[PDB]
Amino acid sequence: HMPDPAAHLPFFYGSISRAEAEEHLKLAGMADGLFLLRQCLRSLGGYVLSLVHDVRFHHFPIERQLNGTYAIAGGKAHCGPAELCEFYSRDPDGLPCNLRKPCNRPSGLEPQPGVFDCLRDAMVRDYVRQTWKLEGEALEQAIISQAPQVEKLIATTAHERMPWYHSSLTREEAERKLYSGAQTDGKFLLRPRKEQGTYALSLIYGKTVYHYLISQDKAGKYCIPEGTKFDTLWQLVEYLKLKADGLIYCLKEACPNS
Ligand SMILES: *c1nnnn1-c1cccc(C(C)=O)c1
């Protein structure tokens, strides 16, 4: 069972950072129209089309629409990632150039599972079991056939189930909790602040605790101080595990709550 419908594509890397993506493309010798597909870490169920042209990198976010299709911003809709990559191979339709050489995964390397795989394989699975009591091949398919709005809802409160989320911690209590454990770089927790609906990332770097404000837009996207936007806190954390993006350091291991 592969929860991501792009899992069968040889050029799909799963949940990787932009740096690793660009690394794979360089070792593919660069060249115009060299491309790969990866999971989007900001938009739930989405992808990023990583392309190179004029020996410089391009990254096109692909958003999953409500009706289950996929589209680059202002672009046409496609029923799936596979369909999407095939179309753009035969017609740039806004891209700097058409997809040519697929930067396939090197032998041994599988797609990295991320939030989306976990959302479906664990959380939607349990949601489906609780509501319909399905078991075998009926539980699967049902897992990949839920509406994007249901997946979004589960994902939105998923952080409440994560060990790094501390539902009631002051700034001072967070520091004390972090200093009183292993003071390793990237040790972290997330905590709600007074103002609805703001949160704080508390992390250790150089044996010093740092606090970062997280606020959500009027669009409901969760924003780090650098301004990068995420559908969920869960995605925000998983993203910062792979890229600092205005943090003094990446998130590594959770400071456990209970
Ligand atoms: C995702 N992929 N494997 N396991 N998970 C996961 C992590 C934390 C919580 C949950 C729940 C409660 O479903 C699943």
Swiss-Prot record:
Phosphorylated on tyrosine residues upon T-cell antigen receptor (TCR) stimulation. Ubiquitinated in response to T cell activation. Deubiquitinated by OTUD7B. Residues 104-163 are annotated as: Interdomain A. Its main location: cytoplasm. Changing R193W: In ADMIO2; decreases interaction with phosphorylated CD247; decreases ZAP70 phosphorylation; no effect on subcellular localization of CD69 at the cell surface. Changing P148A: Increased kinase activity after activation by LCK. The keyword Ubl conjugation applies. The modification Phosphotyrosine is found at Y249. It is linked to Immunodeficiency 48: A form of severe immunodeficiency characterized by a selective absence of CD8+ T-cells. Composed of 2 N-terminal SH2 domains and a C-terminal kinase domain. The tandem SH2 domains bind to the doubly phosphorylated tyrosine-based activation motif (ITAM) of CD247/CD3Z and the non-canonical phosphorylated tyrosine-based activation motif (TAM) of RHOH. These sites have been implicated in binding to other signaling molecules including CBL or VAV1. This is Tyrosine-protein kinase ZAP-70. The lineage of its organism: Eukaryota, Metazoa, Chordata, Craniata, Vertebrata. The gene is ZAP70. The chain holds residues 1 to 257 of 619 of the full protein.
